[PDB]
Each structure stands twice: as structure tokens, then as C-alpha cells.
From a paper:
Purified Esp was crystallized, and its three-dimensional structure was determined using x-ray crystallography. Esp displays a β-barrel fold assembled from two discrete domains and a C-terminal α-helix, similar to eukaryotic serine proteases of the chymotrypsin family. Even though Esp exhibits a highly conserved, compact β-barrel fold, the five or more intradomain disulfide bonds that are responsible for the structural rigidity of eukaryotic serine proteases are absent. Each of the two Esp domains is comprised of six antiparallel β-strands, and the solvent-accessible catalytic and substrate binding sites are situated at the interface of the two domains. In addition to the conserved position of putative catalytic triad residues (Ser235, Asp159, and His117), the substrate-binding region (S1 pocket) and the oxyanion hole, which together constitute the critical functional elements of activated serine proteases, are also conserved in Esp. The distances between Nϵ of the Esp active site His117 and Oγ of Ser235 and between Nδ of His117 and Oδ of Asp159 are 2.8 and 2.6 Å, respectively. The conformation of Ser235-Asn234-Gly233-Gly232-Val231 peptide segment in Esp is rigid with conserved backbone angles, supporting the presence of a functional oxyanion hole. Compared with all other eukaryotic serine proteases, loops 3 and D are absent in Esp and V8, and their loops 1 and 2 are also considerably shorter. Crystal structures of Esp and V8 display identical disposition for their N termini, which associate with respective S1 pockets more intimately than other active serine proteases. The N-terminal segment of Esp and V8 crosses over loop 1 into the bottom of the S1 pocket, and the N-terminal Val67 (V8 Val69) amino group is suitably positioned to act as an acceptor of the negative charge of P1 residue side chain.
We show here that Esp cleaves autolysin (Atl)-derived murein hydrolases and prevents staphylococcal release of DNA, which serves as extracellular matrix in biofilms. The three-dimensional structure of Esp was revealed by x-ray crystallography and shown to be highly similar to that of S. aureus V8 (SspA). Iwase et al. reported that S. epidermidis Esp, a secreted serine protease, can disperse S. aureus biofilms.
Residue numbers in the entry: 67 to 282
Write the structure that this text describes.
Amino acid sequence: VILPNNNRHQIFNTTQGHYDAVSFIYIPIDGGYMSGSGVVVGENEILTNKHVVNGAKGNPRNISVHPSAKNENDYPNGKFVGQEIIPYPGNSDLAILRVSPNEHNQHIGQVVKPATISSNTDTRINENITVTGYPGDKPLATMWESVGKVVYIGGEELRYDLSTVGGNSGSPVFNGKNQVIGIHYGGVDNKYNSSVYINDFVQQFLRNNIPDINIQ
């Protein structure tokens, strides 16, 4: 959903700082492909949307994850294939994807630093945030950072005023400490963008499936 606030900047030094965990997702469908985004949060784990993993039609092996992808011809951290899809049991567009190790028996959370999850104890409306991931209007597997403000927090719903584009499905929403406060899932044209807010209940689901999860 493209809004009056469309402040987007490409990221090139993708393997450094907090960008490293921001991941590009590619799923073939016989006619073409679908793409999306996610964020590495544990040794073998990314967070993304239910609607993203549902594109695999029940086979996790159809999902390729490229952490820190720079463009279609530059995956500096290679890829990791889907192994197990663990949907968040609650009523939000959130899933964990566990991935296999790569061809060098490296784990995804060893090649990049797993992202820091916010406890969201301090998160409030009007807060300045970024949503960073792989928009579909841009060239395949290019990373973009969008700047915006939180407008709504309720239940598992966090809405902001910044712009995103199909492919931004699954993009982490960062606070100023570069901690993940939520996971983008879509938007309502001319009104706001929407994300899964990482509330206490979501945090419990993360802890119960990702033993090493870093929540601060």
C-alpha cells in the first residue's frame, strides 16, 4: 500500500548491521513465482507471513530463503531451503519457517546474526519505525528500507503510515533500537499499512518454538 509517506531507500551493504537478518523469499508456482520477505530470528528459523508460506502448497522444500540478498544475481549468504512450516496458532498472519542447513552444513542463524525481537514494552503510537524487506515493485531480491510512524496498536495489530509493495509481505518492522516490533502483512489503500504486532502472546509462541529467541 503506497501512502503519502513513501520514503524508501535501497540497502546495498546488506550483510552488515541489522540488515543481515532481513531475508528474501522465492517460491515457484508452475505459472511463475511468488516472492516475499522475512527475518532470521534463530539458528534455523525465520519469521514471515502465513500467506507467504501458504504459497508453497504444503511443501516447505518449495521455499528458498536468501538472507541479506542484494539483488537477483547477488545472494552473498546463499540460500536455505524450507524444512518445516509452523503457523502462529492465533489470528494473525504469522508463521515460523524452519530451514535446512546450506550446502556447507551452516545454519542460517550462524551465517547472519538472528534479529533482536522487542518485548514491545515501550512501543507506542507516533513512534518512528522502519519496515525493511523486498518490495515487489522493485527489482527482484533488492532490499529497501521505508521510514514511517506507528498509527495504531491493538491486540495483534500494529498499523503504520509508511509505504510498502507486494513482496513486502513478511518484512520486519524495526524500532529505533533496530529491534523487531512486528512483521508486515499488508495494508488498506489510502489508509495505512498493517503488521503482526509481537505482543506477549506472540512472544510466548516464539519462545516455545525458537529456544534461543533473543527478546529485549
